[PDB]
Design a protein around this ligand. Structure first.
Ligand SMILES: CS(=O)(=O)c1cccc(-c2cccc(C(=O)O)c2)c1
Ligand SMILES: [Cl-]
Length: 242
């Protein structure tokens, strides 16, 4: 069911880094990873948490639809793309933390905790501040647990409406061409050691789906582009994409 290929470590070590990629072949119900231990180690989700947060906000009506405009609060932040209005699509695309912090305040602790438990999401622990627990609170999730959660979303099996799941999967759209579609979300965790980058999602093909979850050490922001680059290089190696 699970196979470890330690030769894939080269994708990380050649960049003087360390990490894990986890792949799941949906048709064959088989998983692959370079590091079984790290595949099951739980890290802060950071901005990959925008997937469940979006689902919960939509299903409770905190967010009406993917067109609703969330106005900039007028506080200048150091990420230029955050200093403007957003909807759910652009907020996901540019990982706009302060929009999602307001979602969480409106969701509230009680409803947030119940929904993460319904989702079987990570350790289901929201200890910390309700507007930042996914950045520096007690919540943790592993790469294998990310895949488990994403598969439920793909099949519309999470305990929210089908509409909420279709909208979030639209907002996860990252890349599409004549060969494949990638729906995914990046993450960057810096407030608690070890600092890591995430990329989780799936690749749609004509006749199969491949789910993926990766994290890697990220001592500086200079390596963030390696999250997608390494993942796609593994996918090309395994001939999942050309
Ligand atoms: C410490 S931070 O202000 O949260 C911070 C520092 C550097 C970068 C980012 C960031 C912002 C938006 C998108 C992405 C990204 O990796 O797609 C990354 C956030
Ligand atoms: Cl779409």
């Amino acid at each position: 069911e699970w196979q470890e290929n330690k030769s894939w470590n080269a994708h990380f070590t050649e960049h003087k880094s360390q990490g894990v990629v986890v792949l799941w072949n949906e048709n064959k119900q088989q998983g692959f990873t370079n590091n079984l231990k790290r595949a099951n180690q739980a890290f802060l989700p950071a901005s990959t948490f925008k997937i469940p947060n979006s689902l919960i906000a939509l299903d409770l009506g905190v967010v009406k639809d993917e067109h609703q405009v969330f106005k900039w609060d007028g506080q200048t932040r150091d990420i230029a793309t955050w200093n403007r209005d957003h909807n759910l699509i652009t907020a996901m695309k540019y990982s706009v933390v302060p929009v999602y912090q307001e979602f969480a305040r409106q969701i509230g602790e009680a409803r947030m905790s119940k929904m993460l438990h319904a989702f079987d999401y990570g350790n289901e622990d929201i200890s910390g501040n309700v507007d930042s627990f996914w950045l520096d609170g007690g919540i943790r999730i592993s790469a294998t647990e990310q895949i488990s959660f994403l598969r439920k979303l793909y099949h519309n099996k999470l305990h929210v409406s089908e509409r909420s799941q279709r909208i979030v999967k639209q907002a996860m759209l990252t890349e599409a061409n004549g060969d494949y579609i990638i729906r995914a979300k990046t993450g960057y965790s810096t407030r608690i050691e070890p600092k890591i980058g995430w990329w989780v999602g799936w690749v749609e093909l004509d006749d199969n789906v491949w789910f993926f979850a990766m994290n890697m050490d990220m001592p500086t922001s200079d390596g963030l582009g390696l999250r997608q680059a390494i993942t796609k290089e593994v996918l090309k190696q395994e001939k999942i994409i050309p």
